[PDB]
Amino acid sequence: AGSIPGRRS
Amino acid sequence: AGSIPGRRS
Amino acid sequence: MGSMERASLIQKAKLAEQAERYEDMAAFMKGAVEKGEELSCEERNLLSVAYKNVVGGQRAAWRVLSSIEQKSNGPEVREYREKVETELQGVCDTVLGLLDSHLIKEAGDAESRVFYLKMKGDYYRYLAEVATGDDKKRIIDSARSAYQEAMDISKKEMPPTNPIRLGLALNFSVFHYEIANSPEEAISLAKTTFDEAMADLHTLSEDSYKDSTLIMQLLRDNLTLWT
Amino acid sequence: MGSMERASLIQKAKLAEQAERYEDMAAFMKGAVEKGEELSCEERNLLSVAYKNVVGGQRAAWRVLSSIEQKSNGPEVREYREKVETELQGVCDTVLGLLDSHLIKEAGDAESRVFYLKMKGDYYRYLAEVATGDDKKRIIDSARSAYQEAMDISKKEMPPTNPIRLGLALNFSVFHYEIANSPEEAISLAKTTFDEAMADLHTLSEDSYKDSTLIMQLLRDNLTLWT
Ligand SMILES: *Cc1ccc(C(=O)N2CC(OC)C2)cc1
Numbered sequence: 001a002g003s004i005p006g007r008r009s
Numbered sequence: 010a011g012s013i014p015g016r017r018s
Numbered sequence: 019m020g021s022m023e024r025a026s027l028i029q030k031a032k033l034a035e036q037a038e039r040y041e042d043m044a045a046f047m048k049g050a051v052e053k054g055e056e057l058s059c060e061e062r063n064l065l066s067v068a069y070k071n072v073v074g075g076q077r078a079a080w081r082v083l084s085s086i087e088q089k090s091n092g093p094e095v096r097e098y099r100e101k102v103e104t105e106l107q108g109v110c111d112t113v114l115g116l117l118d119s120h121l122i123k124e125a126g127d128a129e130s131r132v133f134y135l136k137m138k139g140d141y142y143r144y145l146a147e148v149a150t151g152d153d154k155k156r157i158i159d160s161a162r163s164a165y166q167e168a169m170d171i172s173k174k175e176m177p178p179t180n181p182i183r184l185g186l187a188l189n190f191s192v193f194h195y196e197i198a199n200s201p202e203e204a205i206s207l208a209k210t211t212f213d214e215a216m217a218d219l220h221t222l223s224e225d226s227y228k229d230s231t232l233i234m235q236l237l238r239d240n241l242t243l244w245t
Numbered sequence: 246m247g248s249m250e251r252a253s254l255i256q257k258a259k260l261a262e263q264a265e266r267y268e269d270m271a272a273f274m275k276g277a278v279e280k281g282e283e284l285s286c287e288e289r290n291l292l293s294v295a296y297k298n299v300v301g302g303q304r305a306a307w308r309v310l311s312s313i314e315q316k317s318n319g320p321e322v323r324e325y326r327e328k329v330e331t332e333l334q335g336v337c338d339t340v341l342g343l344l345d346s347h348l349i350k351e352a353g354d355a356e357s358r359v360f361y362l363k364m365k366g367d368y369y370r371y372l373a374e375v376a377t378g379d380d381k382k383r384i385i386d387s388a389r390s391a392y393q394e395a396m397d398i399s400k401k402e403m404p405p406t407n408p409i410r411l412g413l414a415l416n417f418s419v420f421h422y423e424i425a426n427s428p429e430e431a432i433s434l435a436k437t438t439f440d441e442a443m444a445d446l447h448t449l450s451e452d453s454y455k456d457s458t459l460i461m462q463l464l465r466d467n468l469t470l471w472t
Pocket residue numbers: 004005006007008009136181182183184185186229233
């Protein structure tokens with residue numbers, strides 16, 4: 001189950 | 010130019 | 019970071035991201051927040067990316083060690099899992115402290131207020147992942163309450179395709195599935211979120227369409243895993 | 246790490262490796278070295294893997310920032326490159342301090358002494374990568390001298406297929422090519438190393454054959470890039 005990949009910005 | 014990948018042991 | 023200019027902290031956070039130095043990036047953005055000014059859209063993203071990466075590495079390590087620890091059931095594996103767990107809890111507490119002092123109370127626009135409240139739900143969710151004792155229930159309710167307040171605002175103030183609204187619903191659905199033991203609520207939220215966004219796509223530019231459909235696919239991936 | 250048992254430090258270094266927590270792994274192995282006992286073959290590898298990963302991340306970040314800095318030619322990019330550079334130099338100095346106090350002087354067997362001296366050459370090579378001023382020449386000679394002493398021992402005491410001997414020659418050839426501006430010496434060393442190992446492969450078991458041919462391929466890859 002994936003949450004938001006907020007790893008790149 | 011690659012040295013030894015001693016990243017796993 | 020009190021002696022460094024706010025703009026320099028922001029500049030160095032961007033450099034640290036390029037260098038994949040996420041601990042530095044988080045310290046720079048923590049320093050920027052503590053200057054006391056509100057954050058722009060771009061700055062909020064820098065803050066969020068930095069701490070997501072830091073805690074993301076800690077969660078991955080905690081899961082490795084928790085798995086080893088469960089297969090074993092000396093004190094070393096438990097001791098080291100505890101060390102990692104304490105360090106993760108400290109990072110979550112730091113982020114929650116930034117939101118509480120004073121990002122959330124000064125956030126009046128829907129886009130900033132929903133963003134910070136989603137953050138609050140996420141970092142309580144990370145605390146809940148490792149919680150066991152007398153406060154696991156209270157931590158879960160703290161996550162639910164932040165997500166719920168963010169949901170209420172986003173439904174009132176944002177279009178169904180807004181990426182923050184979509185990412186909030188995605189993570190709240192993961193909260194329902196993984197933390198709250200409510201898989202039916204998780205599936206219902208993801209499906210209603212997906213369907214209402216689909217019906218709003220006709221209003222978007224080519225670039226906004228790409229942004230929204232990307233996150234809708236993440237909802238779809240979860241539904242495929244859950245059903 | 247003075248209050249933790251040597252065996253617990255070793256155990257936790259292995260756990261940290263599994264968790265990809267290389268900074269912890271290096272601190273645990275630093276604590277193990279400082280117990281004052283010699284290190285076994287496996288323990289030497291743990292020490293080496295830990296610090297290679299830590300400095301490997303720092304070198305990658307330094308290269309990103311140095312590239313940005315050169316494209317720019319405010320003070321932020323230089324300042325942050327300097328910060329990363331200082332942190333990298335501190336890690337190299339720490340490893341070099343462990344070798345000097347007192348791993349190398351207590352290492353009498355060829356396998357341990359060549360291993361530590363190769364380490365010494367590597368961490369001076371990393372210092373040379375970022376050096377500019379009055380000591381760049383002296384740092385390069387410190388790397389060359391450690392590699393050379395290790396080479397002399399390995400040629401006298403190890404078979405041409407020994408993986409430590411092969412990895413030493415590989416990295417010394419990279420030193421020649423990248424640091425000493427001696428590409429012909431680099432190519433000659435890699436080719437003579439490869440050829441002498443090929444002629445010794447017939448003596449090896451299936452598993453030793455796999456170990457040696459793996460590193461011979463790294464020599465071959467470099468020769469392909471260099472010629
Ligand atoms: C909560 C949240 C974060 C990020 C987005 C977004 O637009 N994303 C994820 C990736 O960049 C971080 C594309 C939406 C919602």
